[PDB]
């Protein structure tokens, strides 16, 4: 039933297949909802979605800066169509700092964790996080253990130096009388990409997020 067609493919040049263009696309890395836990907390990683993970697992070592764009949307409940122009606070917490536990925790005024204050009805917030790893490049794969303790023996393949930090987003505005749900979309665009040691592509379904186990099909 399929029509067997063809075309005279006329093309030249290799600038499109550059690694800077291969992995340099802004991809959605997380999407979460919270109805006014009570705030958005998520550790930054590129393995959340299978497509981006498969693309990134084509190399062993990758070094890049991170560009983050936060796109918030609000939907009301029960009665006008007037969405409040709330103020949002997105704070980046590095690995060596504690993360907030509640909406009004003390860490929201850290003065060392960078924070962005932006409004709902404004252009989406955007900030660039540099290459913060302790090593020269991130390890897409790690054949080893964090330490010698029996606790670390259950953490095969986890290198503590590969964590990228936490992004905590909250609504600074107090509880409004109305009921609303906030949806947060995080877009990550790597910059200044450098990649080393290409690897065979993944051909089998993933069974977990941190072990590279495989199952049927």
């Amino acid at each position: 039933e399929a029509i067997q067609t063809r075309a005279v493919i006329n093309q030249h040049g290799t600038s499109e297949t550059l690694v800077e263009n291969f992995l340099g696309r802004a991809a959605l890395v997380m999407m979460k909802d919270f109805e006014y836990q009570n705030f958005f907390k998520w550790t930054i990683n590129t393995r959340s979605y299978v497509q981006l993970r498969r693309k990134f697992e084509l190399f062993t070592y990758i070094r890049f800066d991170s560009e983050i764009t936060i796109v918030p949307t609000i939907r009301l409940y029960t009665s006008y169509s007037g969405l409040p122009n709330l103020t949002l606070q997105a704070m980046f917490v590095p690995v060596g700092a504690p993360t907030p536990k509640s909406q009004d925790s003390y860490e929201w005024q850290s003065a060392c964790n960078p924070s962005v204050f932006f409004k709902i009805d404004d252009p989406p917030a955007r900030m660039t996080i540099p290459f913060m790893c302790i090593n020269s490049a991130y390890g897409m794969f790690y054949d080893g253990f964090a330490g010698f303790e029996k606790t670390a023996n259950g953490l095969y393949g986890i290198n503590p130096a590969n964590t990228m930090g936490n992004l905590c987003i909250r609504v600074v505005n107090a509880y409004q009388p109305v009921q609303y749900t906030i949806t947060i979309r995080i877009y990550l665009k790597p910059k200044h990409i450098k990649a080393w040691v290409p690897r065979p592509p993944r051909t089998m379904p993933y069974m977990s997020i941190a072990n590279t186990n495989y199952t049927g099909h």
Binding site: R6, A7, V8, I9, N10, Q11, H12
Partner: protein, 235 residues
């Protein structure tokens, strides 16, 4: 009286061979800088570069016109047909020659127009033309509504296409040279046509004591045939 000789075929003409090059371009070849990015074509300068004389058609007083689609008209004729059936990629020009045989007591005018990418249409229906309607081979088609060129345009404005006039009191021959007319360097001969040679009788053929029928002879010669290589070594 001169002759148009191409390969092993020759046509005797009435010295009216004022050739009309379509858009002022001679068919030359695929340029070198356009061939690096695509498959490399060879140049079969074989018997493909000869005139193919189709069967003569009858011009009557009620004729609406005839059209031939290229390279569909030559897809099953001679060495060109063989090369078309064995190669999947082709690129060639054409040199159409139209001749008429009439006495000094005949009258009529033919508009020999080469229409590129002539997408044939239908009349009072939404369904597109079927395969048999378009691909007519060497027999050729017959215009149903020559006033609209069978496509909703106007024959009056068809003069913008590469054309020649055959007025029986002035001349009886037309010669249009067609270059490569496509948006791609090469194309597929079996299911796409580049030119449509149309012969529309603008002024009806008339006479009082004549034969009431004159023959029209169409001769088409591919000019710069190029096909994909079928014998590149794989070592």
């Amino acid at each position: 009286v001169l002759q148009l000789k191409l390969g092993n075929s020759a046509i005797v003409t009435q010295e009216a061979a004022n050739m009309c090059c379509a858009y002022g371009e001679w068919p030359s070849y695929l340029p070198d800088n356009e061939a690096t990015a695509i498959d490399k074509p060879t140049q079969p300068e074989t018997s493909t570069d000869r005139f193919y004389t189709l069967k003569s058609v009858k011009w009557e007083g009620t004729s609406t016109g005839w059209w031939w689609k290229l390279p569909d008209a030559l897809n099953q004729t001679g060495m060109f047909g063989q090369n078309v059936q064995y190669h999947y990629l082709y690129r060639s020009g054409f040199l159409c020659h139209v001749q008429c045989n009439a006495t000094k007591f005949h009258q009529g005018a033919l508009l020999v127009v080469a229409i590129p990418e002539h997408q044939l249409g239908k009349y009072n229906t939404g369904t597109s033309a079927s395969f048999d309607d378009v691909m007519k081979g060497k027999t050729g088609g017959v215009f149903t509504h020559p006033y609209v060129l069978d496509d909703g345009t106007s024959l009056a404005c068809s003069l913008i296409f590469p054309h020649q006039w055959i007025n029986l009191r002035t001349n009886n021959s037309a010669t249009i040279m067609l270059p490569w007319m496509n948006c791609a360097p090469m194309d597929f001969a079996l299911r796409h046509n580049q030119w449509t040679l149309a012969i529309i009788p603008v002024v009806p053929l008339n006479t009082s004591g004549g034969t009431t029928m004159v023959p029209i002879t169409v001769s088409i010669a591919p000019m710069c045939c190029e096909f994909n290589g079928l014998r590149n070594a794989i070592t």
